[PDB]
Amino acid sequence: TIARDIVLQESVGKGRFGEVWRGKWRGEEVAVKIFSSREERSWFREAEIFQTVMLRHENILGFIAADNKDNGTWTQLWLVTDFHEHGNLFDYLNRYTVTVEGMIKLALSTASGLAHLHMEIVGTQGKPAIAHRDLKSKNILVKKNGTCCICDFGLAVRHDSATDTIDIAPNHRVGTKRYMAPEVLDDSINMKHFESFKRADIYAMGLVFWEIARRCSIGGIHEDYQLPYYDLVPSDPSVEEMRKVVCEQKLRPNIPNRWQSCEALRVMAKIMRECWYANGAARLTALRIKKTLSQLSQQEGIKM
Template structure:
């Protein structure tokens, strides 16, 4: 289209509701952001049983983040930029305002995972697939949110989702679920960064413990009952920047939803990281997983917002 390469996502007629939801989310002008997939138009094609529903968006040849990480090792700079762009996108979704300061309705993605993140270029990602996203409109009732059901991908579901104990009266609950899922994706990116030492083959979160498509019951046993999270080896924490990032990740996947950082707070931490010199490596550091002697300034520490 006018020299602009596009992608067409085609929904069969039985997936009309998903197409309708995603097209409605995309047509909200306040969704536009550098870290959100660029939407062009929605169309329905054909008639009867052959009817199809199209979403036409920007095309990104590097594919999704899962596939990209499978074949690429990231530098520390690449990790900062790519992870920062993902965080920026989630913070924008969750925000009550656009970057220009105009009021907007916050959006919960509800299915953040590495296959729903596209690689725009070597240092930028964009969020995609808003088929089960929900607008956190204060005018909606608890019943409206309850009827949206237990959704998402089991591997990335937060503990409270697995347990079906989401506080539907608090719209922040939906954002906290996204932050948990985002933390798993950040872990995936961190696992493929050259500063962690030996970079192992790419693996999904909990990859060695579960099947390729684990069910909710399996994830409930690991995450909810076993309090399991992806491993953060002590070797990752030798690099000060990675230690700071791992601290942030662990605060984002906290078992208690209210103890998790907000996406906005995580975005502030990434802005802080970008200003700091993490080129030096403290080889004397021998910390166990989840420990850190490096602390950001108090204003950027974990404070529920």
């Protein structure tokens, strides 16, 4: 219970569901996602995902509390989290270029958060695997230390490895069309196999890594900010437009020939290709991507 101890400052955005405000909790800046009684289901689902035992991780948005005022107003349901002044990765990459170190910090942090989300921990204080289903640069926040954290669990799915039960709402195609994996675009995805969701998140993470790498400046040389497929689909692409490029034409975002000249960009490009296979079962796992980027950061003396 926390809502009565928070002063709402200003609205900062609107999620898939709910409105996000910057607030102050006993002087500390917090983010508050507010929902009306009408979106009780989306509030309830996100609060449930956040309350998962052992989910806390520096690269997953820090949950503080969920509250219900039972007042019948637009401030009835609360989800209170940490506040990150920079906002999202999309805005960050539009404003700034990054150094090789900065790129590795953004990529490794995203992979670390997704590996934690995907990881099944067996025990008493155990953890079920979770898939995001809408990973994109607009759903990643940039912290003051230059690392990322994943947010917006409104479409997330939880697995029960014992009874094969998938906690899913809705049990159909969701997400941002631009970032949908080929198997999602062509309806071949096996919705009863939890691994399918993890594989689709990996494909989307590969597209986010391409967005970051384009902004990696070495001696002032870098690319302008673009969304994946900016050159191949119109703004707000339909499922048909995406299917033609991704499934039929087998196209992926172009990897600049100049990324082969830098070891960090070579490692990033190899990870992207191995996230992008049409065969989802051949893609890398988030844990393996995390450890590849961790080894590179360790050897190069990059500390997080």
